[model samples]
Target: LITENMHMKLYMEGTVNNHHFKCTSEGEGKPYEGTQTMRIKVVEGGPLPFAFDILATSFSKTFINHTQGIPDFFKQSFPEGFTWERVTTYEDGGVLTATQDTSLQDGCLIYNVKIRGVNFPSNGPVMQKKTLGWEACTEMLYPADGGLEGRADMALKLVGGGHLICNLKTTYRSKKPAKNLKMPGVYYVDRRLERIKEADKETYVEQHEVAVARYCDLPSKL
Candidate 1:
């Protein structure tokens, strides 16, 4: 029997992609830094369900949904009850992955994402403070067999510059499950970030600290 409740926390930091922004005099494309704290809750029942709460110093509220399908990163690591398939592929080595599962009786993942609190100035005479919000397809990637190593990435893009790429990685910090532990879930996380820019290519990497905990005693509504 697996535990019913689980919690995960992740810390992230990364550089802002310059190409993802418009070059405007009003501070649109300027050097900026950011950090993030993400929390995840996994509820197991008729169908497995999960939720997320993210906080960032540079970006705004973000959401994740797995309705259309689950990404390969997550598909490879799920339990035996779930189903998955490859829907589409891109010429640039990108592929679209989808999932179906008995655990997810609802058959859809809904997330309300918002890109607010960004300190970027508008491209006008009057300096405008604004925030952006949108929807995203989200997926979780973990070791297929088991362990505390995994990553989750979000698929959401901005209007003009580029899409918002959010990636999170988990490493061993402390605590381990016992051999007989049915569904033990608890973890401590650490965070960091790095930025690399080339003549025409730029990359942003975010890292952070996180703590995950799980409980199987709760009642299931589904």
Candidate 2:
């Protein structure tokens, strides 16, 4: 259900050293900051009930696809570029989707996305972000984890008013048995938006995660 004029914050935590590069550190020890505003409007046919009028600018970096075993975000011939798509729905509390990109290695879909935006079951507060690079680990800047390692919370403040929260824990392990360690690995509790805010700033996201992932996968419903 994500539509145009939706404001979201992709927050990050954890530490980055010279060895990592996923997120660029902004301040002395602050997480990086990147903001994107899309004037999404309902277009024509899509997998969901509607399509998006995507007029996106001010991008830190174009989003890269990471899911495997599916077509790229859009069909290979889409006029505007995309990285992911809403694919299918599950009766269970989850929605699954796929990713693909011409620039990436062929064969596997890039990343598999699952969202439970609604009142699905969960452990508690959950927050985490992942980087695909295995060797050149990336550093995340924001969310105030300080310079040391510990658990962190990443928040997404909706333009309408409420927020989505997630809890993530990091564990650093060595790449070589006795050499320098790879990036600190993170385990996240997939979160559902706990509270919905009431505002008319023109924001729309699927009320649940399963729907959101499905919307990104198929164009027949748009």
Candidate 3:
């Protein structure tokens, strides 16, 4: 049985202005860095809980121990992306549901769910195959550089130990001479930890927008 205590790591590296800081006399340090192994907890349904960690050089750099606040929730506003929908409820108190969305290209389909909160297997028959009609867009944001217009292709797979691994590859071109930018590479994450926990539910849903700037907006602080 897979519990929410499973551990995972996010392998993300990109050039974001927000991560830039004044380098010491030692010279400019690498702006690209990866996250430490983080734990997954399901706060609402199991003994563990759902949560996210805003990791950085200043944080404690440990699972659960380093986590300081509630998780942040983001919704897709346009260009069709995944959204949760409760599909059915069984008398046995079991619920069957999924997140359904149209790919940015509008040619393929992305449907998924967390089975038993332990396993995540793609429901493929319902997923649409990519077609010529589906083309990557230019309006999406690429993490590699600013002023570079691009779109990303996303893929999800199970990485054992109760982890849902996500990979995103962004492709882009310079809109101007100064906009010349490096293409974004794959960004991986564990979806299981991408949720808010009940303890901090109110804070994440209500006060986060305001409190965040105070506690977390800085380069480093709890």
Candidate 4:
């Protein structure tokens, strides 16, 4: 349920060889602070095309086939002449649906989007801001030890023939599933244990973990 308009504070820092780049996409993941938001206009067609209305946010317009998978946040797109569909438009189209099954208390509105934005060819000439790359990873639900066990890496390819690499470790020192989505679809929440090595004092320091992954939901039951 991540929509445009929600502000972001991206922790970015890296370097093109020796010259470093450090910045955070400002606004702290809020609604008002950030200057980007979008709404959709449906265009009729057999496959359906969606056009977006954008504010000041800029990036690139392209598509990603997640079955093979790829993605991220936005502030800018390199090499210029492109703009990310700020209004969260899935140009080619993703079936945008909203659902409510108030069986669970404190549920948020659930939006199922097959984001069809990025509706451009991933193959083009070099230096043309062509293909975007991707790597898939998973988030585990468990009482974390020393805060993992969790981390993320991002890169920026420089025009001069190198890259700017930055990293933000997923540190959940005081972590736990703040919320869970899907009630009717709440297939199940998986669990695990904190890796509290044993044999010394087995009183079960292994914490019971629960799933933190889910589709966004809104609550009438909270």
Candidate 5:
């Protein structure tokens, strides 16, 4: 079980493949630099019994073509590209359900779930024809130490007919007062991504060092 008021900060770096446009003459062959810093807070609610507030800043060498008004290629794959906010996830038996939280104004319901390896009622552009598999392991550092270490691995197929494999490893050490245990820690992160496709098969790695502390002196409920 996780602590009730857990918080975390992550500094990330990763590489991405431009497999979407195999023939693109520019931004090809060379890997672009990617970096991100994110702050996360866990709250109580939702079917999964927990909600996450994630704020992030990202920088990347590649740019998107926003002027073309949603590309036709992405239209079929990501129909609701930016229409929703918040996602709530829960697991029952062995199935996982992730539902989008669209306000009443949208008057729409989108259900995204995972079953055995296949995604049912596909909502994204990529459809997973094969069973997707993921595994994670974590070691606690309490009562003996003051932090945790974890690693995860997963494989999935995208709607645009591409396969992606990911591996991630992380460690956290806290410096908060023992009486009021809060998440203020030094973190280390590493990630790798591999994409397989007919056109743009690429691989990239990301490494990060993060320092987490109090954002402000305001009361927790303010």
Candidate 6:
């Protein structure tokens, strides 16, 4: 069964370089209970030629973690040869790593981002046409070189015991840089972990309502 508008809390812990970090969300993150808005700023030229940023608000404002705008682009458009992607690799027992890079001709909007973590399937599938779970990525910040550095990880303890590790690096790009930028859509992915009990038998569920501009209509009071 599929459900939306449900509340969720994620306890995330992972290694970033030589440091270990963990965050217990102050409030639950909600699906379909958030907003994404945009604005342009006038700042000194540095990374890009424009000052555009994306803003997203939520039930707990925790959704703001990922909606802080993208790593590159301006005026809802892409460069001649554009690309944005995250690649994931994993081990047999339970170890995962992901590297992501986003850029254009001018410079890298986000670059050299590598993160490591672990997840389900004691011995998972090695094919492309198979996916049984969902993962919610965390907030990616700008790295030292002024490019975006992204990472995501978590550990969900299960009584069934048998554990599998998989890292999914999502790709966000298209064929026609210009023609592709003109397409728009919205969708969300939710996974309900049912078993044991901590905050509820449901401690993990990933929800995403993505809207690719170029094609959208806002009817707030209609």
Taking the tens digit of each residue's C-alpha lDDT, what string does model 2 give over 26-117? 11101011112222211222112101101010011122121322222222212222232222221323222222221112321122112212
lDDT of 2 at 71: 22
lDDT of 1 by residue, 82-138 (tens): 222222221223222222221211222122211211222234111211112223332
Candidate 6 lDDT over residue span 1-222, tens digit each:
101232333233333223333323222223233422212121222122110100011101112212224322222333332233444434444333433332233332212233343442333442221333323333322222222233333223223543333343444443234434432223222222222112311232222333221212345675
Q: Model 2's lDDT to the true fold?
A: 0.21
**On residues 32-120, what C-alpha lDDT tens digit does candidate 4 reach at each position?**
12222122112222111111111011111111111111111111111111111112221222221111111111222111112222322
Question: TM-score, each model?
Answer: 0.24, 0.21, 0.18, 0.23, 0.20, 0.27
lDDT of 5 at 41: 18
**Native-referenced Cα lDDT, model 4:** 0.21
Model 6 segments more than 4 A misplaced: 1-81, 93-123, 127-131, 144-146, 154-163, 166-222
Candidate with best TM-score: 6
Candidate 1 global lDDT = 0.23
Residue range with the least summed lDDT across 10 consecutive positions in model 4: 53-62
CA deviation > 4 Å runs, candidate 2: 1-31, 46-94, 100-182, 187-222
TM-score of 4: 0.23
Q: List runs of model 1 lying over 4 Å from the truth.
A: 1-131, 144-146, 156-162, 172-176, 182-222
User: Tens-digit lDDT track for model 5 on 1-222?
Assistant: 111111222122211111111001111111112222212211211111110100111101111121212211111222222111112121211112111111111322122111111222343322212322212221111122543333333344444555444332333223233344433232222222221221111112122212111123357774
Ten-residue stretch with the least lDDT total in model 3:
205-214
lDDT of 3 by residue, 101-211 (tens): 222233222222222211212232101111111111112332344322223232222223222222222222222243332333322221111222223321121001001
Best by lDDT: 6
Better of 1 and 6 by lDDT: 6
lDDT of each: 0.23, 0.21, 0.21, 0.21, 0.21, 0.28
Superposition error at 58 for model 1 (Å): 12
Which 10-residue window in model 5 sums to the lowest lDDT? 50-59
